[PDB]
Amino acid sequence: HAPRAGPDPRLLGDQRVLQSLLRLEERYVPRASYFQCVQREIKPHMRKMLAYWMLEVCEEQRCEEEVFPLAMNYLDRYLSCVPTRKAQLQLLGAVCMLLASKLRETTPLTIEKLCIYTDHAVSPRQLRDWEVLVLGKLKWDLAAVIAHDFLAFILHRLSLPRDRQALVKKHAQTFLALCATDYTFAMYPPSMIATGSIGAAVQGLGMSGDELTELLAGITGTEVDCLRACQEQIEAALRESL
Amino acid sequence: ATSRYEPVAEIGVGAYGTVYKARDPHSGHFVALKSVRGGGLPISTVREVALLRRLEAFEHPNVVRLMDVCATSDREIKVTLVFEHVDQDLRTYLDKAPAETIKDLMRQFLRGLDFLHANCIVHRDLKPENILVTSGGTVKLADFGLARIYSYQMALTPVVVTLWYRAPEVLLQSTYATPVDMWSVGCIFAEMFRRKPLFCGNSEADQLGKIFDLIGLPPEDDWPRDVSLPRGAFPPRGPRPEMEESGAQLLLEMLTFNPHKRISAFRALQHSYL
Ligand SMILES: CCN1CCN(Cc2ccc(Nc3ncc(F)c(-c4cc(F)c5nc(C)n(C(C)C)c5c4)n3)nc2)CC1
Numbered sequence: 001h002a003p004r005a006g007p008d009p010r011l012l013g014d015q016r017v018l019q020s021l022l023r024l025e026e027r028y029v030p031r032a033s034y035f036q037c038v039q040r041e042i043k044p045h046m047r048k049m050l051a052y053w054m055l056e057v058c059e060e061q062r063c064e065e066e067v068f069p070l071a072m073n074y075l076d077r078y079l080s081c082v083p084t085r086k087a088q089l090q091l092l093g094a095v096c097m098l099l100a101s102k103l104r105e106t107t108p109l110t111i112e113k114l115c116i117y118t119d120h121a122v123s124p125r126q127l128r129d130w131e132v133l134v135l136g137k138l139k140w141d142l143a144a145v146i147a148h149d150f151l152a153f154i155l156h157r158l159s160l161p162r163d164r165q166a167l168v169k170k171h172a173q174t175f176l177a178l179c180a181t182d183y184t185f186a187m188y189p190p191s192m193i194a195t196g197s198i199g200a201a202v203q204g205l206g207m208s209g210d211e212l213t214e215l216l217a218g219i220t221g222t223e224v225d226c227l228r229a230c231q232e233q234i235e236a237a238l239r240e241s242l
Numbered sequence: 243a244t245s246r247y248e249p250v251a252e253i254g255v256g257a258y259g260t261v262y263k264a265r266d267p268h269s270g271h272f273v274a275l276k277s278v279r280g281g282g283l284p285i286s287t288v289r290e291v292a293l294l295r296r297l298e299a300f301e302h303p304n305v306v307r308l309m310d311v312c313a314t315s316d317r318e319i320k321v322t323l324v325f326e327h328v329d330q331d332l333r334t335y336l337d338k339a340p341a342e343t344i345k346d347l348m349r350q351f352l353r354g355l356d357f358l359h360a361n362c363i364v365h366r367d368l369k370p371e372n373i374l375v376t377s378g379g380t381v382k383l384a385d386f387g388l389a390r391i392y393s394y395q396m397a398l399t400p401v402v403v404t405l406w407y408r409a410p411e412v413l414l415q416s417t418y419a420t421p422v423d424m425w426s427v428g429c430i431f432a433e434m435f436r437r438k439p440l441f442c443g444n445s446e447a448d449q450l451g452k453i454f455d456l457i458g459l460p461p462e463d464d465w466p467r468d469v470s471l472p473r474g475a476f477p478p479r480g481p482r483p484e485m486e487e488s489g490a491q492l493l494l495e496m497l498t499f500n501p502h503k504r505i506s507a508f509r510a511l512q513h514s515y516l
Pocket of ligand 1: 252253254255256261274276306307325326327328329330331334371372374384385386
């Protein structure tokens with residue numbers, strides 16, 4: 001009645017699948033920093049405020065883990081090419097969550113549910129209108145590759161047993177959500193956010209840290225020094241997320 | 243300057259809407275149009291367009307090419323997908339009489355599905371109507387409204403694939419993955435020789451019975467555990483129409499009950515038959 005997707009070894013073990021994601025990911029990285037040249041009214045702290053609001057909606061509705069970072073991907077790509085005013089941020093963020101949920105969830109968010117969390121002046125008509133507007137500006141290219149998509153592939157390449165991964169996965173998910181709330185990670189390749197979050201999670205739970213960083217970098221073809229700096233930034237952002 | 247494609251033929255109708263052959267009256271060029279029929283956009287439309295947009299970055303020769311997506315608007319908005327036109331489907335291609343072509347057709351069919359699977363995409367609706375063939379003989383996979391990116395631990399839509407091409411694990415309401423498309427491939431491979439559907443069941447239980455009549459009843463170590471209908475509900479059956487030796491071997495590896503032992507699209511392309 002309600003099946004869940006198991007771990008397909010035909011996918012996790014086929015190196016071409018991981019290579020395909022690595023080739024696709026740069027296509028979905030937001031162009032440049034829209035805060036200096038494109039957005040004027042919208043400031044970085046406003047994005048962080050909106051991100052926490054979006055994350056709370058996704059948490060309170062128990063969305064799948066990909067929905068929030070995917071919605072943030074739509075938000076950043078939209079703001080990279082459409083000047084927007086502060087008063088429209090909430091409506092934009094609500095629509096990004098709606099589209100991400102419709103794409104990835106068997107039981108997705110609805111326009112009526114989003115009206116619980118939006119201020120009362122926002123209406124279903126506006127949400128319907130902005131869904132179409134955002135789709136148009138993103139060219140309907142919603143099947144983005146985000147960091148969570150790499151999680152299962154990387155964990156498959158650790159010999160840590162499937163059961164012992166349970167807490168690693170849970171803890172890594174905290175770091176993945178954190179990165180999406182923080183604009184300093186907005187332009188990192190999703191594969192680096194994924195390996196950095198896994199590295200921070202496996203280290204935080206306690207075969208050494210340097211060997212693991214070496215392995216995590218080798219899995220994705222990343223420079224070791226670049227992965228080490230990203231993981232340290234991720235760890236620092238968590239401790240300072242205040 | 244703007245041009246307009248005008249519809250000149252209806253080529254399909256579904257709950258998803260209508261597909262049209264369309265023609266620019268000033269250039270004579272053809273496309274195919276697929277028109278979409280608190281609320282918001284339909285989930286199937288958002289998914290189909292998103293998957294095609296992701297696949298458009300590769301320009302693979304064995305998948306239909308999405309050219310454009312027009313949303314126009316009155317209270318109701320109409321979404322129109324524009325595809326490069328293909329002249330026919332696999333059924334129309336066959337009733338035009340060689341085995342040499344079937345191997346090349348099968349080669350292209352497997353290449354397109356392997357490209358989907360290698361891109362984390364499961365089709366979940368493979369059938370002769372969704373397999374198109376250009377006038378030059380190039381296979382083009384179509385209809386991605388039921389397709390999804392497969393992500394470990396995500397919830398799955400329990401009932402997928404049309405009845406006659408549905409895999410046993412789905413018929414038994416078990417979980418499933420990429421092998422579901424490979425079961426449809428086996429059914430389509432055999433249908434190119436039979437020119438008639440292999441398993442024309444009357445229901446889900448009738449479909450499993452027709453399946454077990456040819457593949458034989460799996461023992462017990464192969465029966466899925468997350469199903470309610472047990473193995474003792476079906477009668478015992480044994481295995482075993484005019485294809486080759488090695489072709490029958492390749493067919494049985496596609497029509498394997500256990501999806502974990504079912505041949506992949508990649509390994510089938512490496513088969514001695516092709
Ligand atoms: C009335 C029966 N007669 C005789 C049989 N004939 C079959 C036939 C079917 C299709 C084409 N051409 C074509 N070219 C490019 C495309 F992209 C699609 C296309 C795209 C999509 F997105 C689709 N989504 C769905 C559900 N379909 C189905 C319609 C397959 C899609 C098809 N179709 N030429 C012939 C129709 C006329």
